[PDB]
From Swiss-Prot:
It is found in: Secreted; Bacterial flagellum. The chain holds residues 229 to 278 of 495 of the full protein. Induction: Inhibited in nutrient-poor medium (at protein level). Individual Salmonella serotypes usually alternate between the production of 2 antigenic forms of flagella, termed phase 1 and phase 2, each specified by separate structural genes, fliC and fljB. It comes from Salmonella typhimurium (strain LT2 / SGSC1412 / ATCC 700720). It comes from the Bacteria. This is Flagellin.
Length: 50
């Protein structure tokens, strides 16, 4: 689900597209796997149209 770009100042290894699930009625994000650990894949883009 949604891929969030992360830019960390002063920290290494926390950069990456985090998987986020958003329900706007609550206004928060459900954690993927119950953690905020970075995912793999680097910075892949699927759809060219923006």
């Amino acid at each position: 689900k949604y891929y969030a770009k992360v830019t960390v100042t002063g920290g290494t290894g926390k950069d990456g597209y985090y998987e986020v699930s958003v329900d706007k009625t609550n206004g928060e994000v459900t954690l993927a796997g119950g953690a905020t650990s970075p995912l793999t894949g680097g910075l892949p883009a699927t759809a060219t149209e923006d």
